[PDB]
């Protein structure tokens, strides 16, 4: 009764060579819930925005995805609205008034019906965030949107789920999330327990540390997976609504010129914007898991791999390049910790970045770990 929640990126199909990942590559049987990412909202009319219509509609992306239920009827297939690239201002604008919320809600209902989705995942990043076009009133009005969506889903009578991807930093919770009221309306809270460190922070560090490290101070003191999930509990979310995100990617850095200190917390060349882009994801500061293992794990690799003894995450470096990530050892540790805490399950961003080709060894090695641990686990009653 635990969840294994798999986000699927619709843009992964454009990655070159062995990076190409489409609907047919999803290992459906390893997941209990799979989420097509992303749709957005229109700026002007507050309706569902289809972001890649040639792929999503003309080549039948949405329906290929949802029709996977024919062979796997026990799996739920939903869609996510929002995500980083969509920005936050259109969402803050959409929730500002009852009328614009109801237009969005109606559009959502039409969309889910048309493409046979099982529900909606809310991925607005983030209500109340000033750097993302948000403002103070988002907190109340995001809750209203959620209540109104739930009521609309009830009226449709198809048992649709409504979930949300959420941050774990306290200031973001204070700015955007009425925790007890949201957790009551949502079927699951997908906690983004990753991107907790990165180039924007100005130092090198792993991005999903499980526990506090000695160098964690001020806004970072509690910014780790364990304390962050504890924060969601403390703010009123039941343990059996919390799903813990696991990143299948690493955050990378370019170290400062002449820096020979590779320890956690070491200074970086912030203006570089992150580590050099990798060949398949082509994004500064970001490496898919398979881009990491093909570089770090080869027999003749010149990369040095280390282990964060407190955060329980690997990191690796070579030259000016430094990457923190999750590997089978760190994922296993997190799976055991999820069961120890009694949380609802595990989530991954994102299934298209697992070693799905088996370039490094076992195909789909990371999602197999989530599936192995969660499928044998019984979620206990709320604590
Ligand atoms: C959907 O499936 C059809 C038939 O297999 C295929 O031709 C098409 O490329 C698929 N669309 C996408 C977006 O994967
Ligand atoms: C890689 O990303 C950059 C933007 O950073 C883009 O301009 C460039 O065309 C991309 N290269 C490939 C091979 O897609």
Residue numbers in the entry: 24 to 406
From the paper:
The glycosyl hydrolase family 18 (GH18) chitinases (EC 3.2.1.14) are enzymes that hydrolyze chitin, a β-1,4-linked N-­acetylglucosamine (GlcNAc) linear polymer, into chito­oligosaccharides. Among the eight groups of insect chitinases, group I chitinases have been enzymatically well characterized and have been shown to function in a chitin-degradation process that is closely associated with insect moulting. Our previous work reported on the group I insect chitinase OfChtI (previously called OfCht5) from Ostrinia furnacalis, a species of moth that is the most destructive insect affecting corn production. OfChtI is highly active in the hydrolysis of chitooligosaccharides, colloidal chitin and α-chitin, and exhibits kinetic properties that differ from those of bacterial and plant chitinases.
To investigate the substrate-binding mode, three proteins, OfChtI-CAD and its E148Q and E148A mutants (referred to in the following as E148Q and E148A, respectively), were crystallized by either co-crystallization or soaking with substrates. E148Q and E148A are variants with the catalytic residues mutated. The crystal structure of E148Q at a resolution of 2.0 Å was obtained after a six-month incubation of E148Q with chito­hexaose. Unfortunately, no substrate was found in the structure. This indicates that E148Q possesses partial hydrolytic activity. The substrate-binding energy changes for E148Q were measured by ITC analysis using (GlcNAc)3–6 as ligands. Based on the ITC analysis of OfChtI-CAD E148Q binding (GlcNAc)4–6, an increase in the polymerization degree of GlcNAc [from (GlcNAc)3 to (GlcNAc)6] results in an average free-energy gain of approximately −1.0 kcal mol−1 per GlcNAc residue. Additionally, the binding of (GlcNAc)6 to OfChtI releases 1.0 kcal mol−1 more free energy than the binding of (GlcNAc)5 to OfChtI, demonstrating that OfChtI possesses at least six substrate-binding subsites, as deduced from the crystal structures.
